[PDB]
Amino acid sequence: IVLTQSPGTLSLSPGERATLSCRASQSVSSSYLAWYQQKPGQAPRLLIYGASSRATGIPDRFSGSGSGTDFTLTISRLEPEDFAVYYCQQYGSSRFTFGPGTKVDIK
């Protein structure tokens, strides 16, 4: 399974909504699709698992949706601490690969 992500880079202001896409080349088994946030100098932190479950402690402004091959991460109202690179990962089959990332930068 190959994951692609779009956009590549997106610059927004605090308070704006970000809509991030992840597309899988084949259906993802059981909706085992996760999303991570990586801030500079840190390991990625899990935001969403099973396509639409928020991980423990993750605020409700992050939302994951989708099934099959098309997945979306929405950040409803960006806070300054949300500017980072966001990755999807499929863990339903084969090598558990990552998408190439979407950089969400401050406008």
mmCIF file with all atom_site columns, N, CA and C in Angstrom, residues 9-46:
data_model
loop_
_atom_site.group_PDB
_atom_site.id
_atom_site.type_symbol
_atom_site.label_atom_id
_atom_site.label_alt_id
_atom_site.label_comp_id
_atom_site.label_asym_id
_atom_site.label_entity_id
_atom_site.label_seq_id
_atom_site.pdbx_PDB_ins_code
_atom_site.Cartn_x
_atom_site.Cartn_y
_atom_site.Cartn_z
_atom_site.occupancy
_atom_site.B_iso_or_equiv
_atom_site.pdbx_formal_charge
_atom_site.auth_seq_id
_atom_site.auth_comp_id
_atom_site.auth_asym_id
_atom_site.auth_atom_id
_atom_site.pdbx_PDB_model_num
ATOM 1   N N  . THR A 1 9  ? 2.544   21.406 1.547  1.00 0.00 ? 9  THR A N  1
ATOM 2   C CA . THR A 1 9  ? 2.713   22.468 2.519  1.00 0.00 ? 9  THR A CA 1
ATOM 3   C C  . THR A 1 9  ? 1.462   23.340 2.463  1.00 0.00 ? 9  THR A C  1
ATOM 4   N N  . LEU A 1 10 ? 1.078   23.843 3.633  1.00 0.00 ? 10 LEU A N  1
ATOM 5   C CA . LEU A 1 10 ? -0.100  24.693 3.807  1.00 0.00 ? 10 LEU A CA 1
ATOM 6   C C  . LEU A 1 10 ? 0.264   25.729 4.861  1.00 0.00 ? 10 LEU A C  1
ATOM 7   N N  . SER A 1 11 ? 0.124   27.022 4.581  1.00 0.00 ? 11 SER A N  1
ATOM 8   C CA . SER A 1 11 ? 0.356   28.021 5.629  1.00 0.00 ? 11 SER A CA 1
ATOM 9   C C  . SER A 1 11 ? -0.949  28.709 6.014  1.00 0.00 ? 11 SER A C  1
ATOM 10  N N  . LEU A 1 12 ? -1.225  28.779 7.316  1.00 0.00 ? 12 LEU A N  1
ATOM 11  C CA . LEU A 1 12 ? -2.503  29.262 7.800  1.00 0.00 ? 12 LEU A CA 1
ATOM 12  C C  . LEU A 1 12 ? -2.257  30.114 9.035  1.00 0.00 ? 12 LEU A C  1
ATOM 13  N N  . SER A 1 13 ? -3.249  30.863 9.422  1.00 0.00 ? 13 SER A N  1
ATOM 14  C CA . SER A 1 13 ? -3.161  31.636 10.655 1.00 0.00 ? 13 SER A CA 1
ATOM 15  C C  . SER A 1 13 ? -3.831  30.903 11.807 1.00 0.00 ? 13 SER A C  1
ATOM 16  N N  . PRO A 1 14 ? -3.418  31.183 13.058 1.00 0.00 ? 14 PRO A N  1
ATOM 17  C CA . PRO A 1 14 ? -4.166  30.676 14.207 1.00 0.00 ? 14 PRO A CA 1
ATOM 18  C C  . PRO A 1 14 ? -5.640  31.028 14.075 1.00 0.00 ? 14 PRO A C  1
ATOM 19  N N  . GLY A 1 15 ? -6.484  30.086 14.451 1.00 0.00 ? 15 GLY A N  1
ATOM 20  C CA . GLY A 1 15 ? -7.908  30.205 14.327 1.00 0.00 ? 15 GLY A CA 1
ATOM 21  C C  . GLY A 1 15 ? -8.503  29.612 13.070 1.00 0.00 ? 15 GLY A C  1
ATOM 22  N N  . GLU A 1 16 ? -7.698  29.379 12.036 1.00 0.00 ? 16 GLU A N  1
ATOM 23  C CA . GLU A 1 16 ? -8.190  28.842 10.773 1.00 0.00 ? 16 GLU A CA 1
ATOM 24  C C  . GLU A 1 16 ? -8.343  27.324 10.850 1.00 0.00 ? 16 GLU A C  1
ATOM 25  N N  . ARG A 1 17 ? -9.109  26.774 9.912  1.00 0.00 ? 17 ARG A N  1
ATOM 26  C CA . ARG A 1 17 ? -9.281  25.325 9.789  1.00 0.00 ? 17 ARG A CA 1
ATOM 27  C C  . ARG A 1 17 ? -8.304  24.737 8.780  1.00 0.00 ? 17 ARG A C  1
ATOM 28  N N  . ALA A 1 18 ? -7.697  23.595 9.119  1.00 0.00 ? 18 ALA A N  1
ATOM 29  C CA . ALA A 1 18 ? -6.846  22.859 8.191  1.00 0.00 ? 18 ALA A CA 1
ATOM 30  C C  . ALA A 1 18 ? -7.510  21.527 7.856  1.00 0.00 ? 18 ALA A C  1
ATOM 31  N N  . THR A 1 19 ? -7.542  21.188 6.565  1.00 0.00 ? 19 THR A N  1
ATOM 32  C CA . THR A 1 19 ? -8.107  19.942 6.072  1.00 0.00 ? 19 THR A CA 1
ATOM 33  C C  . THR A 1 19 ? -6.993  19.218 5.324  1.00 0.00 ? 19 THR A C  1
ATOM 34  N N  . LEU A 1 20 ? -6.571  18.078 5.846  1.00 0.00 ? 20 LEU A N  1
ATOM 35  C CA . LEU A 1 20 ? -5.432  17.335 5.324  1.00 0.00 ? 20 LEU A CA 1
ATOM 36  C C  . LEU A 1 20 ? -5.932  16.005 4.771  1.00 0.00 ? 20 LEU A C  1
ATOM 37  N N  . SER A 1 21 ? -5.426  15.615 3.608  1.00 0.00 ? 21 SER A N  1
ATOM 38  C CA . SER A 1 21 ? -5.872  14.394 2.945  1.00 0.00 ? 21 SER A CA 1
ATOM 39  C C  . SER A 1 21 ? -4.786  13.338 2.915  1.00 0.00 ? 21 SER A C  1
ATOM 40  N N  . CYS A 1 22 ? -5.192  12.073 3.040  1.00 0.00 ? 22 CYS A N  1
ATOM 41  C CA . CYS A 1 22 ? -4.308  10.926 2.879  1.00 0.00 ? 22 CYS A CA 1
ATOM 42  C C  . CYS A 1 22 ? -5.060  9.937  1.994  1.00 0.00 ? 22 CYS A C  1
ATOM 43  N N  . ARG A 1 23 ? -4.417  9.483  0.919  1.00 0.00 ? 23 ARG A N  1
ATOM 44  C CA . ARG A 1 23 ? -5.014  8.536  -0.020 1.00 0.00 ? 23 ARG A CA 1
ATOM 45  C C  . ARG A 1 23 ? -4.162  7.279  -0.045 1.00 0.00 ? 23 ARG A C  1
ATOM 46  N N  . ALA A 1 24 ? -4.812  6.115  0.041  1.00 0.00 ? 24 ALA A N  1
ATOM 47  C CA . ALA A 1 24 ? -4.122  4.830  0.027  1.00 0.00 ? 24 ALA A CA 1
ATOM 48  C C  . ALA A 1 24 ? -4.324  4.225  -1.358 1.00 0.00 ? 24 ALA A C  1
ATOM 49  N N  . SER A 1 25 ? -3.312  3.515  -1.855 1.00 0.00 ? 25 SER A N  1
ATOM 50  C CA . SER A 1 25 ? -3.413  2.915  -3.181 1.00 0.00 ? 25 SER A CA 1
ATOM 51  C C  . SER A 1 25 ? -4.321  1.686  -3.217 1.00 0.00 ? 25 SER A C  1
ATOM 52  N N  . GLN A 1 26 ? -4.652  1.116  -2.062 1.00 0.00 ? 26 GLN A N  1
ATOM 53  C CA . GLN A 1 26 ? -5.579  0.003  -1.945 1.00 0.00 ? 26 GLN A CA 1
ATOM 54  C C  . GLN A 1 26 ? -6.309  0.187  -0.627 1.00 0.00 ? 26 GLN A C  1
ATOM 55  N N  . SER A 1 27 ? -7.460  -0.466 -0.493 1.00 0.00 ? 27 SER A N  1
ATOM 56  C CA . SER A 1 27 ? -8.242  -0.366 0.731  1.00 0.00 ? 27 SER A CA 1
ATOM 57  C C  . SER A 1 27 ? -7.387  -0.716 1.944  1.00 0.00 ? 27 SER A C  1
ATOM 58  N N  . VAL A 1 28 ? -7.566  0.046  3.023  1.00 0.00 ? 28 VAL A N  1
ATOM 59  C CA . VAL A 1 28 ? -6.845  -0.171 4.272  1.00 0.00 ? 28 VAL A CA 1
ATOM 60  C C  . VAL A 1 28 ? -7.678  -1.079 5.172  1.00 0.00 ? 28 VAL A C  1
ATOM 61  N N  . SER A 1 29 ? -7.120  -2.246 5.513  1.00 0.00 ? 29 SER A N  1
ATOM 62  C CA . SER A 1 29 ? -7.833  -3.252 6.298  1.00 0.00 ? 29 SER A CA 1
ATOM 63  C C  . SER A 1 29 ? -8.329  -2.670 7.614  1.00 0.00 ? 29 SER A C  1
ATOM 64  N N  . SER A 1 30 ? -9.615  -2.903 7.911  1.00 0.00 ? 30 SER A N  1
ATOM 65  C CA . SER A 1 30 ? -10.258 -2.540 9.180  1.00 0.00 ? 30 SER A CA 1
ATOM 66  C C  . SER A 1 30 ? -10.144 -1.070 9.527  1.00 0.00 ? 30 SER A C  1
ATOM 67  N N  . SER A 1 31 ? -9.833  -0.213 8.556  1.00 0.00 ? 31 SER A N  1
ATOM 68  C CA . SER A 1 31 ? -9.693  1.210  8.836  1.00 0.00 ? 31 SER A CA 1
ATOM 69  C C  . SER A 1 31 ? -8.534  1.493  9.785  1.00 0.00 ? 31 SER A C  1
ATOM 70  N N  . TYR A 1 32 ? -7.489  0.651  9.748  1.00 0.00 ? 32 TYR A N  1
ATOM 71  C CA . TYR A 1 32 ? -6.279  0.821  10.566 1.00 0.00 ? 32 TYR A CA 1
ATOM 72  C C  . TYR A 1 32 ? -5.364  1.880  9.946  1.00 0.00 ? 32 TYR A C  1
ATOM 73  N N  . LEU A 1 33 ? -5.787  3.123  10.114 1.00 0.00 ? 33 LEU A N  1
ATOM 74  C CA . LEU A 1 33 ? -5.114  4.287  9.568  1.00 0.00 ? 33 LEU A CA 1
ATOM 75  C C  . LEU A 1 33 ? -4.900  5.233  10.742 1.00 0.00 ? 33 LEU A C  1
ATOM 76  N N  . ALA A 1 34 ? -3.658  5.647  10.960 1.00 0.00 ? 34 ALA A N  1
ATOM 77  C CA . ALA A 1 34 ? -3.356  6.550  12.064 1.00 0.00 ? 34 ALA A CA 1
ATOM 78  C C  . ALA A 1 34 ? -2.810  7.866  11.540 1.00 0.00 ? 34 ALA A C  1
ATOM 79  N N  . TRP A 1 35 ? -2.951  8.902  12.357 1.00 0.00 ? 35 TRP A N  1
ATOM 80  C CA . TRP A 1 35 ? -2.388  10.200 12.040 1.00 0.00 ? 35 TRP A CA 1
ATOM 81  C C  . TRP A 1 35 ? -1.493  10.623 13.188 1.00 0.00 ? 35 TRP A C  1
ATOM 82  N N  . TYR A 1 36 ? -0.354  11.260 12.840 1.00 0.00 ? 36 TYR A N  1
ATOM 83  C CA . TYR A 1 36 ? 0.606   11.749 13.818 1.00 0.00 ? 36 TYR A CA 1
ATOM 84  C C  . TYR A 1 36 ? 0.962   13.199 13.559 1.00 0.00 ? 36 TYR A C  1
ATOM 85  N N  . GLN A 1 37 ? 1.322   13.894 14.631 1.00 0.00 ? 37 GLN A N  1
ATOM 86  C CA . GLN A 1 37 ? 1.853   15.247 14.558 1.00 0.00 ? 37 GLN A CA 1
ATOM 87  C C  . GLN A 1 37 ? 3.324   15.192 14.937 1.00 0.00 ? 37 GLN A C  1
ATOM 88  N N  . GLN A 1 38 ? 4.188   15.799 14.129 1.00 0.00 ? 38 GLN A N  1
ATOM 89  C CA . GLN A 1 38 ? 5.599   15.865 14.494 1.00 0.00 ? 38 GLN A CA 1
ATOM 90  C C  . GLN A 1 38 ? 6.035   17.323 14.558 1.00 0.00 ? 38 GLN A C  1
ATOM 91  N N  . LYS A 1 39 ? 6.407   17.759 15.742 1.00 0.00 ? 39 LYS A N  1
ATOM 92  C CA . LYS A 1 39 ? 6.996   19.083 15.896 1.00 0.00 ? 39 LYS A CA 1
ATOM 93  C C  . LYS A 1 39 ? 8.509   18.987 15.727 1.00 0.00 ? 39 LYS A C  1
ATOM 94  N N  . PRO A 1 40 ? 9.177   20.090 15.387 1.00 0.00 ? 40 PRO A N  1
ATOM 95  C CA . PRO A 1 40 ? 10.614  20.037 15.119 1.00 0.00 ? 40 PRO A CA 1
ATOM 96  C C  . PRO A 1 40 ? 11.365  19.490 16.321 1.00 0.00 ? 40 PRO A C  1
ATOM 97  N N  . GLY A 1 41 ? 12.281  18.559 16.060 1.00 0.00 ? 41 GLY A N  1
ATOM 98  C CA . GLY A 1 41 ? 13.109  18.021 17.109 1.00 0.00 ? 41 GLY A CA 1
ATOM 99  C C  . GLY A 1 41 ? 12.451  16.972 17.982 1.00 0.00 ? 41 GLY A C  1
ATOM 100 N N  . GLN A 1 42 ? 11.214  16.570 17.684 1.00 0.00 ? 42 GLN A N  1
ATOM 101 C CA . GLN A 1 42 ? 10.473  15.606 18.480 1.00 0.00 ? 42 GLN A CA 1
ATOM 102 C C  . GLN A 1 42 ? 10.074  14.417 17.630 1.00 0.00 ? 42 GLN A C  1
ATOM 103 N N  . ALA A 1 43 ? 9.849   13.288 18.301 1.00 0.00 ? 43 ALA A N  1
ATOM 104 C CA . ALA A 1 43 ? 9.248   12.177 17.615 1.00 0.00 ? 43 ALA A CA 1
ATOM 105 C C  . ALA A 1 43 ? 7.787   12.485 17.299 1.00 0.00 ? 43 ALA A C  1
ATOM 106 N N  . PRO A 1 44 ? 7.218   11.800 16.308 1.00 0.00 ? 44 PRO A N  1
ATOM 107 C CA . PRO A 1 44 ? 5.780   11.950 16.047 1.00 0.00 ? 44 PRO A CA 1
ATOM 108 C C  . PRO A 1 44 ? 4.932   11.519 17.237 1.00 0.00 ? 44 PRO A C  1
ATOM 109 N N  . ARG A 1 45 ? 3.819   12.200 17.421 1.00 0.00 ? 45 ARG A N  1
ATOM 110 C CA . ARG A 1 45 ? 2.895   11.914 18.509 1.00 0.00 ? 45 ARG A CA 1
ATOM 111 C C  . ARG A 1 45 ? 1.583   11.476 17.884 1.00 0.00 ? 45 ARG A C  1
ATOM 112 N N  . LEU A 1 46 ? 1.044   10.369 18.368 1.00 0.00 ? 46 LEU A N  1
ATOM 113 C CA . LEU A 1 46 ? -0.215  9.855  17.816 1.00 0.00 ? 46 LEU A CA 1
ATOM 114 C C  . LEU A 1 46 ? -1.410  10.765 18.118 1.00 0.00 ? 46 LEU A C  1
#
